[PDB]
Amino acid sequence: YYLNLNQDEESLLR
């Protein structure tokens, strides 16, 4: 899923 992908990247930033 591309949603899961975006969620990981949004969380990588912390």
Partner 1 sequence: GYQFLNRDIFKSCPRIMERQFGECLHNRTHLIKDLISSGNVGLGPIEIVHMSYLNKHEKEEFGEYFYVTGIEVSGPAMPVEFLEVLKSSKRISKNISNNIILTYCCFNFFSNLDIRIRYDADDTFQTTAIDCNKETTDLTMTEKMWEETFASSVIRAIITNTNPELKPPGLVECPFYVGKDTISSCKKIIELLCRFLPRSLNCGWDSTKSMQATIVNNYLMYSLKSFIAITPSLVDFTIDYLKGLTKKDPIHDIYYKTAMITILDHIETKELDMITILNETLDPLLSLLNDLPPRDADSARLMNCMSDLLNIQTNFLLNRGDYELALGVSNTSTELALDSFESWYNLARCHIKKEEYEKALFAINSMPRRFLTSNYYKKPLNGTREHYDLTAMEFTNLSGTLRNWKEDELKRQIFGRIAMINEKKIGYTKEIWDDIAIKLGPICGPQSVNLINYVSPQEVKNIKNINLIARNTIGKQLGWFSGKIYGLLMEIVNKIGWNGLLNIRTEAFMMCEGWLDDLFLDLYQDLKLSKISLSNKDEKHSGLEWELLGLIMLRTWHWEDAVACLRTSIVARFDPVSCQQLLKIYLQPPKNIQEVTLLDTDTIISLLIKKISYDCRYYNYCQIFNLQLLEKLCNELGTHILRNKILLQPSIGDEIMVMIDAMLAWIADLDHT
Contact residues: partner 1, CB under 8 A: 1-2, 4-6, 8-9, 11-12
What residue has token string 């969380």? 11
Distance of closest approach, residue 10 Cβ to partner 1, in angstroms: 9
User: What would the 3-class secondary structure string for the chain be?
Assistant: CHHHHHHHHHHHCC
Distance of closest approach, residue 12 Cβ to partner 1, in angstroms: 5
Distance of closest approach, residue 3 Cβ to partner 1, in angstroms: 9
